[PDB]
Amino acid sequence: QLIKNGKKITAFVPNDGCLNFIEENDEVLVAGFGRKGHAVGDIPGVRFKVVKVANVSLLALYKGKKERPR
Amino acid sequence: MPVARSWVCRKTYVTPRRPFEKSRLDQELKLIGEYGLRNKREVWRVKFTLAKIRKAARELLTLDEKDPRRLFEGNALLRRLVRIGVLDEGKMKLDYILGLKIEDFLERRLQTQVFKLGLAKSIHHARVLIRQRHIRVRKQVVNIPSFIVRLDSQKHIDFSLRSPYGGGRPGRVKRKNAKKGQGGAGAG
Amino acid sequence: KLTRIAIVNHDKCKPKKCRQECKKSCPVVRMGKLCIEVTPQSKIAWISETLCIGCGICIKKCPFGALSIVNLPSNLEKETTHRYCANAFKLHRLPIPRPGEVLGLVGTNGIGKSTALKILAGKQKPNLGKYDDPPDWQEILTYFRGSELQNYFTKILEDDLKAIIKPQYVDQIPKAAKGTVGSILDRKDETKTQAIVCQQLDLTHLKERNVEDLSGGELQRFACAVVCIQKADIFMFDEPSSYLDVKQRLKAAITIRSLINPDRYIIVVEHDLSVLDYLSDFICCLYGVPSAYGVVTMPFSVREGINIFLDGYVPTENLRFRDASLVFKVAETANEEEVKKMCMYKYPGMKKKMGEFELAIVAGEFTDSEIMVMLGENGTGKTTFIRMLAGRLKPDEGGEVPVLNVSYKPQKISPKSTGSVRQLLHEKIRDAYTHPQFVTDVMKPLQIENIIDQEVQTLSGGELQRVALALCLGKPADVYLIDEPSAYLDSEQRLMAARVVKRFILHAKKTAFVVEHDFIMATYLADRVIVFDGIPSKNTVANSPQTLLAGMNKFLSQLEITFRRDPNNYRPRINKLNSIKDVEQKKSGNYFFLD
Amino acid sequence: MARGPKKHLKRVAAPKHWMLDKLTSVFAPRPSTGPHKLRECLPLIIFLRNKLKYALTGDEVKKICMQRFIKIDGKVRADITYPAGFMDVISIDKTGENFRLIYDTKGRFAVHRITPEEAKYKLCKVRKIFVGTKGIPHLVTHDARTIRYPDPLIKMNDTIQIDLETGKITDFIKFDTGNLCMVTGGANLGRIGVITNRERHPGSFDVVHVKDANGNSFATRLSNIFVIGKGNKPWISLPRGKGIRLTIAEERDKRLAAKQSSG
Amino acid sequence: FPMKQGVLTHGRVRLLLSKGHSCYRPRRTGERKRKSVRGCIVDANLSVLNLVIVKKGEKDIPGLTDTTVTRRLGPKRASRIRKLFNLSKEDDVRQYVVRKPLNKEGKKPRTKAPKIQR
RNA sequence: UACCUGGUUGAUCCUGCCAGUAGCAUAUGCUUGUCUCAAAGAUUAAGCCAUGCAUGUCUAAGUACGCACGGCCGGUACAGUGAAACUGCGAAUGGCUCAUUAAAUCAGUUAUGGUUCCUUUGGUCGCUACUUGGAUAACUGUGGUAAUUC
RNA sequence: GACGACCCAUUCGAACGUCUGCCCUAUCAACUUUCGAUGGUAGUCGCCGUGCCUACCAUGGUGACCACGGGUGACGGGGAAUCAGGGUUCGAUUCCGGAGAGGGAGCCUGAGAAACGGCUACCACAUCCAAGGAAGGCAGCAGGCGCGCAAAUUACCCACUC
RNA sequence: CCUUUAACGAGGAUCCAUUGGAGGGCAAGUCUGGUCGCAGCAGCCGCGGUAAUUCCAGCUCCAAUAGCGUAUAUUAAAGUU
Ligand SMILES: [Mg+2]
Ligand SMILES: [Mg+2]
Ligand SMILES: [Mg+2]
Ligand SMILES: [Mg+2]
Ligand SMILES: [Mg+2]
Ligand SMILES: [Mg+2]
Ligand SMILES: [Mg+2]
Ligand SMILES: [Mg+2]
Ligand SMILES: [Mg+2]
Ligand SMILES: [Mg+2]
Ligand SMILES: [Mg+2]
Ligand SMILES: [Mg+2]
Ligand SMILES: [Mg+2]
Ligand SMILES: [Mg+2]
Ligand SMILES: [Mg+2]
Ligand SMILES: [Mg+2]
Ligand SMILES: [Mg+2]
Ligand SMILES: [Mg+2]
Ligand SMILES: [Mg+2]
Ligand SMILES: [Mg+2]
Ligand SMILES: [Mg+2]
Ligand SMILES: [Mg+2]
Ligand SMILES: [Mg+2]
Ligand SMILES: [Mg+2]
Ligand SMILES: [Mg+2]
Ligand SMILES: [Mg+2]
Ligand SMILES: [Mg+2]
Ligand SMILES: [Mg+2]
Ligand SMILES: [Mg+2]
Ligand SMILES: [Mg+2]
Ligand SMILES: [Mg+2]
Ligand SMILES: [Mg+2]
Ligand SMILES: [Mg+2]
Ligand SMILES: [Mg+2]
Ligand SMILES: [Mg+2]
Ligand SMILES: [Mg+2]
Ligand SMILES: [Mg+2]
Ligand SMILES: [Mg+2]
Ligand SMILES: [Mg+2]
Ligand SMILES: [Mg+2]
Ligand SMILES: [Mg+2]
Numbered sequence A: 001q002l003i004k005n006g007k008k009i010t011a012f013v014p015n016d017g018c019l020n021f022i023e024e025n026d027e028v029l030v031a032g033f034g035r036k037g038h039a040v041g042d043i044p045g046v047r048f049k050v051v052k053v054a055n056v057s058l059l060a061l062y063k064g065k066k067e068r069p070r
Numbered sequence B: 001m002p003v004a005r006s007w008v009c010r011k012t013y014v015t016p017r018r019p020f021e022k023s024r025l026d027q028e029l030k031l032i033g034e035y036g037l038r039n040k041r042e043v044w045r046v047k048f049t050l051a052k053i054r055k056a057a058r059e060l061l062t063l064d065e066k067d068p069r070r071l072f073e074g075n076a077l078l079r080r081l082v083r084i085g086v087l088d089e090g091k092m093k094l095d096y097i098l099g100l101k102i103e104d105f106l107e108r109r110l111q112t113q114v115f116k117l118g119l120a121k122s123i124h125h126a127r128v129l130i131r132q133r134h135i136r137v138r139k140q141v142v143n144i145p146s147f148i149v150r151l152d153s154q155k156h157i158d159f160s161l162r163s164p165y166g167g168g169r170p171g172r173v174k175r176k177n178a179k180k181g182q183g184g185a186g187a188g
Numbered sequence C: 001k002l003t004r005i006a007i008v009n010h011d012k013c014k015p016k017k018c019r020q021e022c023k024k025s026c027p028v029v030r031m032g033k034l035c036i037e038v039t040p041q042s043k044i045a046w047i048s049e050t051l052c053i054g055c056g057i058c059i060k061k062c063p064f065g066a067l068s069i070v071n072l073p074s075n076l077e078k079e080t081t082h083r084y085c086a087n088a089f090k091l092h093r094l095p096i097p098r099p100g101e102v103l104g105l106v107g108t109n110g111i112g113k114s115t116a117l118k119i120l121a122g123k124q125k126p127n128l129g130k131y132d133d134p135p136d137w138q139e140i141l142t143y144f145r146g147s148e149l150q151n152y153f154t155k156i157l158e159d160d161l162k163a164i165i166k167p168q169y170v171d172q173i174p175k176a177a178k179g180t181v182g183s184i185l186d187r188k189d190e191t192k193t194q195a196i197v198c199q200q201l202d203l204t205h206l207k208e209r210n211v212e213d214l215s216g217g218e219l220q221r222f223a224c225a226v227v228c229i230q231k232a233d234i235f236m237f238d239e240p241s242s243y244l245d246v247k248q249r250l251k252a253a254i255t256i257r258s259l260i261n262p263d264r265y266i267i268v269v270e271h272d273l274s275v276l277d278y279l280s281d282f283i284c285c286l287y288g289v290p291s292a293y294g295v296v297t298m299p300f301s302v303r304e305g306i307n308i309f310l311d312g313y314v315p316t317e318n319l320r321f322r323d324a325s326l327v328f329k330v331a332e333t334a335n336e337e338e339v340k341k342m343c344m345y346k347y348p349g350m351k352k353k354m355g356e357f358e359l360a361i362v363a364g365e366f367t368d369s370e371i372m373v374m375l376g377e378n379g380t381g382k383t384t385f386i387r388m389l390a391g392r393l394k395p396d397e398g399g400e401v402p403v404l405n406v407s408y409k410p411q412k413i414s415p416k417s418t419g420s421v422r423q424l425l426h427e428k429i430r431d432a433y434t435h436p437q438f439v440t441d442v443m444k445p446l447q448i449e450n451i452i453d454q455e456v457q458t459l460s461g462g463e464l465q466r467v468a469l470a471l472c473l474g475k476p477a478d479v480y481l482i483d484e485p486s487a488y489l490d491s492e493q494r495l496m497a498a499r500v501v502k503r504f505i506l507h508a509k510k511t512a513f514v515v516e517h518d519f520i521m522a523t524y525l526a527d528r529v530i531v532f533d534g535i536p537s538k539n540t541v542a543n544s545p546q547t548l549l550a551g552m553n554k555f556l557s558q559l560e561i562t563f564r565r566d567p568n569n570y571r572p573r574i575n576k577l578n579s580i581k582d583v584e585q586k587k588s589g590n591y592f593f594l595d
Numbered sequence D: 001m002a003r004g005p006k007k008h009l010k011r012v013a014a015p016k017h018w019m020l021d022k023l024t025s026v027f028a029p030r031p032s033t034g035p036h037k038l039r040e041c042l043p044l045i046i047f048l049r050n051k052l053k054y055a056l057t058g059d060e061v062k063k064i065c066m067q068r069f070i071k072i073d074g075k076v077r078a079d080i081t082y083p084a085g086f087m088d089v090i091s092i093d094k095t096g097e098n099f100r101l102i103y104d105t106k107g108r109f110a111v112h113r114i115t116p117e118e119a120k121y122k123l124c125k126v127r128k129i130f131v132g133t134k135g136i137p138h139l140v141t142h143d144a145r146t147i148r149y150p151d152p153l154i155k156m157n158d159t160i161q162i163d164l165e166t167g168k169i170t171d172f173i174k175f176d177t178g179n180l181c182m183v184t185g186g187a188n189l190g191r192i193g194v195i196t197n198r199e200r201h202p203g204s205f206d207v208v209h210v211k212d213a214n215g216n217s218f219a220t221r222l223s224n225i226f227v228i229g230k231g232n233k234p235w236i237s238l239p240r241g242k243g244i245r246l247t248i249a250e251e252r253d254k255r256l257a258a259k260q261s262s263g
Numbered sequence E: 001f002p003m004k005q006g007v008l009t010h011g012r013v014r015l016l017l018s019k020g021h022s023c024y025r026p027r028r029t030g031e032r033k034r035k036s037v038r039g040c041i042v043d044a045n046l047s048v049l050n051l052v053i054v055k056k057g058e059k060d061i062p063g064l065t066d067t068t069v070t071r072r073l074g075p076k077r078a079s080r081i082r083k084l085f086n087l088s089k090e091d092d093v094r095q096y097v098v099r100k101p102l103n104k105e106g107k108k109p110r111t112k113a114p115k116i117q118r
Numbered sequence F: 001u002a003c004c005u006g007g008u009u010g011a012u013c014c015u016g017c018c019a020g021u022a023g024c025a026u027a028u029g030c031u032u033g034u035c036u037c038a039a040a041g042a043u044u045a046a047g048c049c050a051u052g053c054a055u056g057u058c059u060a061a062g063u064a065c066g067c068a069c070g071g072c073c074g075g076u077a078c079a080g081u082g083a084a085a086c087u088g089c090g091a092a093u094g095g096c097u098c099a100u101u102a103a104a105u106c107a108g109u110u111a112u113g114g115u116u117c118c119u120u121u122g123g124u125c126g127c128u129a130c131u132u133g134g135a136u137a138a139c140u141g142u143g144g145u146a147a148u149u150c
Numbered sequence G: 001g002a003c004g005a006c007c008c009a010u011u012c013g014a015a016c017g018u019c020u021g022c023c024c025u026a027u028c029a030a031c032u033u034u035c036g037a038u039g040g041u042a043g044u045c046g047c048c049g050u051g052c053c054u055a056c057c058a059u060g061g062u063g064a065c066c067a068c069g070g071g072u073g074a075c076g077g078g079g080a081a082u083c084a085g086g087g088u089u090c091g092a093u094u095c096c097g098g099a100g101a102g103g104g105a106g107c108c109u110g111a112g113a114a115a116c117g118g119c120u121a122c123c124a125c126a127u128c129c130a131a132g133g134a135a136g137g138c139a140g141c142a143g144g145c146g147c148g149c150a151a152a153u154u155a156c157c158c159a160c161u162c
Numbered sequence H: 001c002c003u004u005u006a007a008c009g010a011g012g013a014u015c016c017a018u019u020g021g022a023g024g025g026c027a028a029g030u031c032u033g034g035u036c037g038c039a040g041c042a043g044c045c046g047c048g049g050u051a052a053u054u055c056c057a058g059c060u061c062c063a064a065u066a067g068c069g070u071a072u073a074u075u076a077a078a079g080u081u
């Protein structure tokens, strides 16, 4: 659920086993998918993807360069 | 706030449109090997400075002869080219400019002349020497490998007057070891 | 990083007209956990102090302006100047010292005041909070480039303005120093300013009253006289109203204010009642958690700062949650039984000396069942009285030998417990209870936790005094002998200690005598009181235990102070010794309102 | 806001013929109110440090001018941003040199030293003619001067040679076909030639022709002609190259032949 | 709050004062303010009154009238001097001017006087 | 450098679009040795604001009895340095932002023969008198209010 | 020589006016008017021209060549990005013009202001209090809260341009 | 700060170059180990159901390089205004 609008949207998590970093009720920064309005690939009706969970990247949370702040 | 500055600046290259094209990659790699440059960008600079000359040449050649503008600017452009050794005074006319190849701007680089005028063992050794402040143009050290040598500056390139290679104190290696004979081989 | 919370205080929150879009979409309510507590009802929509994430979605969609964000305090690890040692209390940024005016500081006991003062005086270099490899005046003077500290620290490194400071404790320095009467003062710095501070502080008697003669109040007066005459450029004053006369607080205030003018930096820190408004010009409030971490705020004006410290507890920027409105115990509730078994342990009007003090007595109808409070100026012998009752001079020419067992609280804080206090908690034992008298007293500022296991030598005097109180009411006694119990304590823990000892001993219909120099604890402990009249160095008479009003009337009219009770927070304040109010109150004698 | 007159002038917006740089700082001297227009003037500060190099910074100009050394038309001016302009005759006594402000043929002022037996008279161009109270005829020149009782044949667009200690006009050239002229506006700035024509479109900007000493002709507006000679004989001395405005194909040849790359 | 002439009440009121008025000093050429002043009537709701003596009786007030008037300061406009010493049109206006005597614990004593103006 | 390439079919030829491709400018991720330039709270909220600072000014030439300092003894217009205070001038330029505003603003073009203009520059200055009047500030002294550049 | 001063000119302007030039919208086709809308006569007022405003009189003016109404994440331009040739999109932003100091309104002083680093009042906020009263305007420079995907130090100095 | 200069300062196991790919479009492996229509990849076509040139990793190779990837607005490609 977004901060500014308050409206609800579904988002993808972009690599093998990342869904364990995402605790419940923390923030996230969602981005676009890649075709400017449209669901990409085989997923039905998902148009956004995560980049940061709690001010730390997914690419760094997953490559080991950083660990969760808690 | 108002401020006392120049914001004027500009780009000096243009990437190619086809990013992975073999006829391109192999030619540019050849040109990097034969003159010992660093990136592809060191080639795209030369491509730009030639493709921009070839626009002024063309737009002049599409004026009518006897024009004031065409006369003045053509006599100015040929002079500027001849003065760096890219054109022959036996040509001196616009319809020859369109016949120049990229490998004539590359040829006039200081790195190229320092090798081809004999002061270094290879086109790679030359780039090292220039960057180490071993060479001098006319009563002036230079440190930029890409410096373009004007036609009558040609025979001034020689080794620096404060440098080991010709009238200078030996460097910090030839001196640390000669000291190993009096501080490491006499009482050490 | 900062812990954002939503709050609801509003002009008529309307759970009867809005249909409660307030609760219909907090993200936490959707996932089971209840953040908000409201349905169609009559009054305020409650909210959890902790279950909102700080989402702010709670705010964007109330139709009326009900909900808003506040920033609860947290340990940020941003702008850490120092750590008391590795792993210890964390200190954030310092106040920028404005010259030409007195810079004051306020906060609870043990939040970073004396460390900030010791840093600003160059006596502690900053370590940037590192446990290891503390820097050395090149990385310092780069950590605060582009800031006033860049130039300020160089001006103190080349000593172009070399600092001077006053100590925290009164009991230390007359042992640590040596000097005979008067000659130390004469040889220290000057004669001229020496002469003006000596007269306006009323210590002209200490040409011949020696450094061994003088009391802890008279020692603070010496400490302040000596640092005022000491020739330096920047000044500091740690606790400069610890054990002073209610008029001499303002006299200390005036004699420090008299050096404002000549481009001198000055910082003062106090646990003030009504004294600093005349002392300081700008205020900087402190917030944090005690001996764990402490944050300093930007400057404020005197009234504005004193107000954002207790007229609520919110900065213009952020929040903290401490120091609310209770500086007078408006909870007017007191009830215990009448009992006709009453013992009237009276005493003769014995006359006694030592070398110089004629301090007369008149008889008093002292009784077992309630506390009697004591008034009087500093240096009039409110101490020697119950010191003599405790098995010293003149029990022979009369003097009622203690009928019940004696618990003695001495005012010179010096318990001889090397090691830790835990073994001094063996000449008593705790196990006799585990009860509100012990818990609600010893705990409040954190827990009982810091004052069980610690060397008493590195101690905040506050909790050592809380332990001296605990070993006083932890000894076999019934007559409890007290002397300035409120000293070295903040406001709210002063009142906690006062209230809880009143209530605890009044469970038993039990004896104590209390020595106060303050107001709040004195006013909520009393139904009778003794007064000391006359000026020191020659004579004094302990008048008989009278009522409260007429007694402290004899007190204040002798001191010529009147007070004012602001109703919004029942706050006390001094009327400025000449007023359109200082004429009615001094004609009718009323200096105590709203009984 | 603008609610009153401005008093600063930005460096970029300044006139071009001042030939100011770009990277010193944001402002330019902003000539003070005077007899010469703001675009046509040349402040005294720009003449002493950008041209004659006598001073180096603004304060040196201020302390050169305060010592009462500089004279603009005989009088002693102490204001460093005073608006000198075309036909003004700066005199520096302490050195013994004099100058005349005349446009160089690229359309800008240049230093032009004159003999001290010449810097006693300056030319003016008549702008208005009117009969004052009691029937006295007056005159207004291009630099705001007012001459009372002038000869009753001097009319508009004419030129008059005055003296700097009296005013009191001495000679006058009459605007007609055949006299010399210097042009003081627009594209043709600082060119010289015989007037040779004047067309007249009533109510709008009458046009004038000219003709150089090499056949070149160039029209202009009449309000930009400034007669400087009876015919083929300029009264006042002239800068080198005499307003001939050679083309760039000729300027290159002279630069090459003279090889003026040193001294 | 002071009192000013001509506001006939015992109350207090707010007036728009300007230059030339009383109870006001303007901070900027061409300014006006709105401030509170008490009416001219006298009542027990004051705190002070300024009274000036106009006719003195026979018994001297102990600490108000027995003292002596100071030297004040002398005149500086030429005709003011002439009017004070009843001088003729051609008496020297010089010589007569009040030569202010000056003593301090520092230097030699001195006499000053004003520069005479007209 | 005036350019295309993958994808509907068992295969083919088309229409046709989705995807790739190169630049640009805002955000963000990973990474970072040297050296010359240098943008930077516009986008949302023209939302709210603790503290400090951003506008003052004296010459030979308006008014000097502050003894404040002062010298060769004198003010006999009156020396000389000069705080303060009256007087004059400036504060309407500069800086910041882009809410408003669609024949409005703005641009080029023209007109004031339909007006005003501190200042600068040049004109103009002849239909009790050897010099008039009273009254204020700084300064001295007494004050009021919790509080103010009262 | 300094200063002041009447009027004339000049200078720096300012003000009003002429011709041509604008993004999207017809699910905006008729609009405008004694609450002046177009014009005439005489005045009021104003620095001057003028329905600018008053009194009497006439019934006019604008529109398919898009009037009038609506929208603009619209301040205009010099310009910026890309660009065979034609074009498309951007221009809050250092130069020029305009407009505004929380929103609306009224005025003093002055050559010049409908001025907010000036004053007066209402609206919304907010500070001090002895509950009588007083005081305020960072879309100047730093700094702080808030807002958000989104933006630097509460440093130094008049030496340079002015 | 840059520039000008004395004195120290290089053997490569550091005085250590990264970011994204390797079926096609589109430069580069029909290597080896693991997983088994799961986990995942993939802008598009498409990969994975026990023998994966496409997933996870080692090795090797490719492109630009003190820089490279992603989201978004926009221009050329678009003779698809
Ligand atoms: Mg009062
Ligand atoms: Mg402006
Ligand atoms: Mg305005
Ligand atoms: Mg000027
Ligand atoms: Mg003297
Ligand atoms: Mg005079
Ligand atoms: Mg089909
Ligand atoms: Mg198929
Ligand atoms: Mg595409
Ligand atoms: Mg790229
Ligand atoms: Mg720089
Ligand atoms: Mg930019
Ligand atoms: Mg904004
Ligand atoms: Mg402020
Ligand atoms: Mg003087
Ligand atoms: Mg004088
Ligand atoms: Mg003044
Ligand atoms: Mg003015
Ligand atoms: Mg800004
Ligand atoms: Mg507007
Ligand atoms: Mg419209
Ligand atoms: Mg509109
Ligand atoms: Mg128009
Ligand atoms: Mg225009
Ligand atoms: Mg126009
Ligand atoms: Mg002036
Ligand atoms: Mg004049
Ligand atoms: Mg009419
Ligand atoms: Mg009319
Ligand atoms: Mg009609
Ligand atoms: Mg019609
Ligand atoms: Mg319209
Ligand atoms: Mg626009
Ligand atoms: Mg807008
Ligand atoms: Mg183009
Ligand atoms: Mg713009
Ligand atoms: Mg905007
Ligand atoms: Mg900006
Ligand atoms: Mg602008
Ligand atoms: Mg204009
Ligand atoms: Mg605002």
Ligand SMILES: [Mg+2]
Binding pocket: G110
């Ligand atoms: Mg004025």
Ligand SMILES: [Mg+2]
Binding pocket: G116
């Ligand atoms: Mg206004």
Ligand SMILES: [Mg+2]
Binding pocket: none
């Ligand atoms: Mg302003």
Ligand SMILES: [Mg+2]
Binding pocket: none
């Ligand atoms: Mg104001």
Ligand SMILES: [Mg+2]
Binding pocket: none
């Ligand atoms: Mg106000």
Ligand SMILES: [Mg+2]
Binding pocket: G117, G138
């Ligand atoms: Mg402001």
Ligand SMILES: [Mg+2]
Binding pocket: G138
């Ligand atoms: Mg700001």
Ligand SMILES: [Mg+2]
Binding pocket: none
């Ligand atoms: Mg944030």
Ligand SMILES: [Mg+2]
Binding pocket: G151
């Ligand atoms: Mg940014």
Ligand SMILES: [Mg+2]
Binding pocket: none
């Ligand atoms: Mg931010």
Ligand SMILES: [Mg+2]
Binding pocket: G158
């Ligand atoms: Mg300066």
Ligand SMILES: [Mg+2]
Binding pocket: none
């Ligand atoms: Mg790799």
Ligand SMILES: [Mg+2]
Binding pocket: none
């Ligand atoms: Mg991959």
Ligand SMILES: [Mg+2]
Binding pocket: none
């Ligand atoms: Mg692989």
Ligand SMILES: [Mg+2]
Binding pocket: H026
């Ligand atoms: Mg591929």
Ligand SMILES: [Mg+2]
Binding pocket: none
């Ligand atoms: Mg391939």
